[PDB]
Amino acid sequence: GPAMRIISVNVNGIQAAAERGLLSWLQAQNADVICLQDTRASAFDLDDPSFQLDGYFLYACDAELPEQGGVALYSRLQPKAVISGLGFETADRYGRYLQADFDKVSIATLLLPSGQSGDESLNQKFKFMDDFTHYLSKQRRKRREYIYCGSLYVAHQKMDVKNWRECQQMPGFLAPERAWLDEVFGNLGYADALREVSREGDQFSWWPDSEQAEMLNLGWRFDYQVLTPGLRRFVRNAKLPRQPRFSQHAPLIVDYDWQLSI
Amino acid sequence: GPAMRIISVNVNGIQAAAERGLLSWLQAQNADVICLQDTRASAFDLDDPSFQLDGYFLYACDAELPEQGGVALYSRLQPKAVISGLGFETADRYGRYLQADFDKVSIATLLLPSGQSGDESLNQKFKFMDDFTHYLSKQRRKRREYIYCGSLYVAHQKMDVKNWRECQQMPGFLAPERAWLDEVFGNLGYADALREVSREGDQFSWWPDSEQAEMLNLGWRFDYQVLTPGLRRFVRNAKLPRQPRFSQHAPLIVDYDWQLSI
Amino acid sequence: GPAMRIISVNVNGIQAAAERGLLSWLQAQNADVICLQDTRASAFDLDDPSFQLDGYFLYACDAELPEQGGVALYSRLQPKAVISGLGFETADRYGRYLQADFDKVSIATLLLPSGQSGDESLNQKFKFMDDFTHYLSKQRRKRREYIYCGSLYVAHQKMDVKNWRECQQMPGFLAPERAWLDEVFGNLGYADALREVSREGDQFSWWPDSEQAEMLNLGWRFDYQVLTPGLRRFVRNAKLPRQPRFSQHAPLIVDYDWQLSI
Amino acid sequence: HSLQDPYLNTLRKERVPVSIYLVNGIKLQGQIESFDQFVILLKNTVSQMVYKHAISTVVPSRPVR
Amino acid sequence: SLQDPYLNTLRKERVPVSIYLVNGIKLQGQIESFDQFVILLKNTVSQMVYKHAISTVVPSRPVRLP
Amino acid sequence: HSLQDPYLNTLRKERVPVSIYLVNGIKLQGQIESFDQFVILLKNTVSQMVYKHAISTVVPSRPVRLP
Amino acid sequence: SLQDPYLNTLRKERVPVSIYLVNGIKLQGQIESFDQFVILLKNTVSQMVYKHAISTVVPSRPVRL
Amino acid sequence: HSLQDPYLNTLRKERVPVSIYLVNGIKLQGQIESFDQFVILLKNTVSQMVYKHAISTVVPSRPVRL
Amino acid sequence: HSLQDPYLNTLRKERVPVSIYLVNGIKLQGQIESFDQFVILLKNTVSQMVYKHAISTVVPSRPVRLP
Amino acid sequence: HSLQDPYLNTLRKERVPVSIYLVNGIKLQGQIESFDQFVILLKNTVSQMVYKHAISTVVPSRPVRLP
Amino acid sequence: HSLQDPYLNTLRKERVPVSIYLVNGIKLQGQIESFDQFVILLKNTVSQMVYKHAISTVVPSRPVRL
Amino acid sequence: HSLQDPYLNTLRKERVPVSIYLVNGIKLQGQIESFDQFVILLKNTVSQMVYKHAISTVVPSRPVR
Amino acid sequence: HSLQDPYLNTLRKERVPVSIYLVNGIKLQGQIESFDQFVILLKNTVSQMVYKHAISTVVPSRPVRLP
Amino acid sequence: HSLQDPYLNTLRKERVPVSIYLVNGIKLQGQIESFDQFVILLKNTVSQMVYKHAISTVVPSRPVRLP
Amino acid sequence: SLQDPYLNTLRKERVPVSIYLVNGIKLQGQIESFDQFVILLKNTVSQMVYKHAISTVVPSRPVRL
RNA sequence: AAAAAUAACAACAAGAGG
RNA sequence: AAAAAUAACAACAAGAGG
């Protein structure tokens, strides 16, 4: 009956996930929209016909410095609209937002600058999140019920990390940034699909490149499905698998109990 | 034929307004129930015969600390009952609600905290606002009619402020404050007793104490008479006099087509 | 003072009620708006001068097949507008709605399929009830006041039937039907006219053709005047005169304190 | 131009009830009496003129032509 | 063209009209005079209602067209 | 043709206070200083050009008649 | 121009369109025939949509020009 | 033709920051840089093209003379 | 007529992902396929028609050449 | 009984405003003036009597201290 | 019984109208004729036998005192 | 128990149509055949035992005594 | 207790199926077999003990007599 | 008098899972753990007490009678 | 009896209780003390409850006699 | 069958009809 | 501050207050 499967994956490079077997998993998982963050490729690179998945439509927004950003979105039917970027220069120069637009719901892939190459990129992350909060101040009045597939690189509360005592100063668990995302996704009333099915942690989506971190397991839960509160009570299923993971991150598989249509 | 007048002037301390000639004006306005908010006086201060208007009964509700709230109610004929306090803590403790139960209608007198001092008052205001919405969810089942003559300290539309572009950030016109009155008047079905007869602009109920803002008439509108849906066809003449003001506020004189009875 | 009288007799054919004495009764009742449901006569059969009450304007909306619906409205004052149709298919085609728009109020007449002709009639009744709940949800944002003089064929409460335990399985007292009238009257805020001035028991609007079911007053209450909340205080009288009846149904005569205008 | 007047004259001759939606969402409803280059006029109970530059659509109540 | 004879017939008989604008607003008065472009009417002050903002013009008494 | 230019030019040369109501209900107070057959200019703090194809009515606060 | 050959191609092979009005109301159907001033739409009853209420014309199946 | 052409050329010469208001209430700050009979180019952080039939009023911030 | 069409041509040749705001405030992103004296077309997933007399503003997200 | 009399009489003497909840959930707010074995008078604006078999609870509006 | 009886007796021998609120919310307004330890007889169009285990409150129309 | 006894005895021995209004709002109308403490019997087509601790009021429908 | 004991005993000797009505209005159907001053035993598929403080009426299904 | 306490002791000994019904019409399952003259206790997960004045009925879940 | 030692052992060990009334409403607090007709309940204010309004007493933790 | 009228939402990919 | 009264929900683990 009802099935709306969207899956958010942070491949950290399409050329990097092309060697592991991303596409043979995406074809098999039977998802209605596949959102991709950090595609790290130009547009005519995805004009190469090896990249498209069978039976789906591909859309992608490019970065200018191509390895820094760029997002993409796979959808089974062609949407009513494909809009790209928000309209400001720290989201259009590096291409971190791409929104397919259907009827009664729209699916937007969202990406943030990392903050892991110095304090200047952390200040870039705070500036982008500031303009994103000013964007949601304009978006809190529409009726298009929004689903943001987003890599925020910030865990919300305490049980979405392990060993947070050392992790207070790493990028991802900053106390003003935690308190401010509590201020944003509080009063504005948005939600996530993960918390509707499990109010306990131990489910994660980011790891460093070291097996020293792997037999000890320090975790970071990043990838969100930001849900406007009309779809707060309509999360069908949500699962985070850390076994066939295609990069430093893990996929996020969310079923919603609607019928996506045009 | 039948007529009933209700006046809901805010006094900013009934002691500092009684020196300015409040009671001698209210004696000569021929009113059936006179609503007074922000009394700033105790239970024995309104027992003194300076405030006893003849031909009226005086009921009051004082705060624990008598400087923060305090709300009074004069009446032509004796009520069936007089109760106080909404039941939650930020309403009864500070003397902010007094309800006079008559035969089929009941006239209540409400005072919201202003939220213009600081965040300690603004958070207090928001908790009064949403707990008041929660109380008003419980009065949708009863068979009484209500007139909440409130000094709500929130202006509703762009007509109720002068130069609304400069007032979106000042407390009194915030977006979670306008959405509260868009929910009380829109979704709960309550009516604004001045909007039912006259939708002319420049009907302002409040001014800052500076002289330039009071002869250039850049004032806001804070005082409303919130009406149950059974009374939105009884308002004849809602009028906001501008000149004989006994505080920063203006009186709100609403004439109805009702017969008040015990 | 200002008065208004409104009659909502279901006739089961205006021809049969006319030969049984309907018009000679309705001329001698002195009402401002007469509402008739199940006219069972085309609009070419109504402007025949047998049906004109003197001094009343006649407006009628027939069914397409002239035996299954058809609804008439006599009116003393000529309305500002006379519209028909609710917008969905099971009213626009079978002629189950007419509306006369006046100055501040607008009086409309409404028929429902009984659901006692067959199971497909019960499916039709459920479709009509659901999209008519959709229409009342659409009308909540409007500014006029409505007097829906309906023959809903749904008994609301246990008071509205004799021997309610025997009637749970029969259509007219099913659980979705009573849930519908507990949604419209309880939750949507609309008032019932006969319940505002009399809450006595044995007042019924329909009797089956058994004489045994008529001498023991085995009735059902199906005729209603649904009112918007801005009119629930204007009702003075509401009676169902049991004996002088001109169909299976009884006439429903309601006296309002409203002064109907042009 | 060449399609407007046969359509309005077909609605006028058979007295077909039309539902004129305006450009603000107000569904006027009645019979067409006459029309010209700029104004149509319709009757429900009182005959009123309706400018054609405020008409969104014209919806008949039964299919014609 | 019934535009101009209809408006003249409202003007000579001096019928109280109600003019519904393109935003729901009505304006009641009497048609004093008119051009091909504007319409001057009087209820309290003389007022120049443009025709590109009129949706309907309804008369309060029923009129006859010549 | 012959019935808006006396009205606008009479509200010029007598310098009445006008209120121009737009086709979205907005009210603009001022006085009519100049006009072609396409725009109206009005003044209270800064001279603005209101286009005529978004003016719904022109209502003067004092009564006037055309010569 | 470019308007009229587009609408002629849209009305020949009978594309299910959604016409979006200037106030936002969408109206679906097939374009029967048009002229300089109106567009006559048809799915269940032929309605005379004025062009000066039409903001956009949206065909579902992408057509050649 | 005879009064909006000087009044818009005297705002594209002196580059007064104008505040051009749409017909649905939306305010637009910018500088007028070009205008024909139909459109007006409004320059700001991006330079856009506004049609005249969507404009209700054209206000400047500081007062200018024809 | 003398300044609109070179602006839309300069938007037409380079694939500038322009945005068109309508007179009710609806934002339509896309590219300009072709236009004529009354209508602009819109290139996105499904090719749209849009009349000029409902268009409020044409804004490019790219700073491009002036005519 | 034993805790009964001391409580009501102290609410009577110090003029504490009570909120008697009857067994329907009706809140009768007022002020205990006198009481026998069976009924309690309260005085809000008209002095009424209240049977104890129809009372569920008495809640004061400020604390009271019992020996 | 010390304060049960003189209140109803002052309501009784002065013939002042009273309002009896029952335990489900029904009000019954009329006069008190006589009463028992268990029973009040109310007076209106017909007399009533109010059992006083269903009575909740008693509100006189004009106030009395013992 | 000193003035309910002649009242119920008078309503019984004159055989009037009474109505017993119960605590939960139900009226039961019929005629009293016998009266006792803890129990009244209401006689109709069936004869039922109403308890006295579920009666709010007892009323005759026409004026008696 | 001058009549309820003969009424219930005559109602149990004749094995009458009866309807107990509770004071909140729950019609219990069954057949009364044994009864106290306080409780009444109701035989059905189970054997319930109903209390007399929660009974409004006891209604038989056929008319019964008194000795 | 004498038929309530043997029945209630009889469901006390064999530890039957009963359902108590309150006069507001709600149910409370559980094992009876102790009782006396004015309150019947009910051992679910927690050990609560239930007044008899507010027990509507007492029903077993399997047919056992009284000796 | 049973209620007297059970409420004594519910009092002295400061057991938080949830008390459910015959109307269906829930009260919460510690017991202060009790008497043949009343229970006094402590929380935000010293409150009186009548035994004839309590249906059930539900403790927070397991208590024993 | 319609707010004698919001000194003005840097803009609701659009309410089968606000 | 309370429906001049639902011929009656084989039963709302309970509406910090209808």
Author numbering:
A (entry chain R), B (entry chain B), C (entry chain A): -2 to 259
D (entry chain K), L (entry chain C): 5 to 69
E (entry chain L): 6 to 71
F (entry chain M), I (entry chain I), J (entry chain H), M (entry chain D), N (entry chain E): 5 to 71
G (entry chain J), O (entry chain F): 6 to 70
H (entry chain N), K (entry chain G): 5 to 70
Reported in the publication:
Analysis of the reference free 2D class averages and subsequent 3D classification indicated three principal types of complexes corresponding to different stoichiometries of Hfq (hexamer):Crc:amiE6ARN with compositions 2:2:2, 2:3:2 and 2:4:2. The quaternary organisation of the 2:2:2 complex forms a core unit that is also present in the 2:3:2 and 2:4:2 complexes. In that common core, the interaction of Crc with RNA leaves approximately half of the accessible surface of the nucleic acid exposed. For the 2:3:2 and 2:4:2 complexes, additional Crc units are recruited through interactions with the exposed portion of the RNA. As such, the C2 symmetry is broken by the third Crc molecule in the 2:3:2 complex. The two additional Crc monomers have small surface-area contacts with the rest of the complex and are likely to be comparatively mobile, which may account for the stronger variation in resolution for the 2:3:2 and 2:4:2 maps compared to the rather rigid 2:2:2 core assembly. The 2:4:2 and 2:3:2 maps were sharpened locally with LocScale and LocalDeblur to better resolve the additional Crc components. It seem likely that the 2:2:2 core is formed first followed by recruitment of the other Crc components.
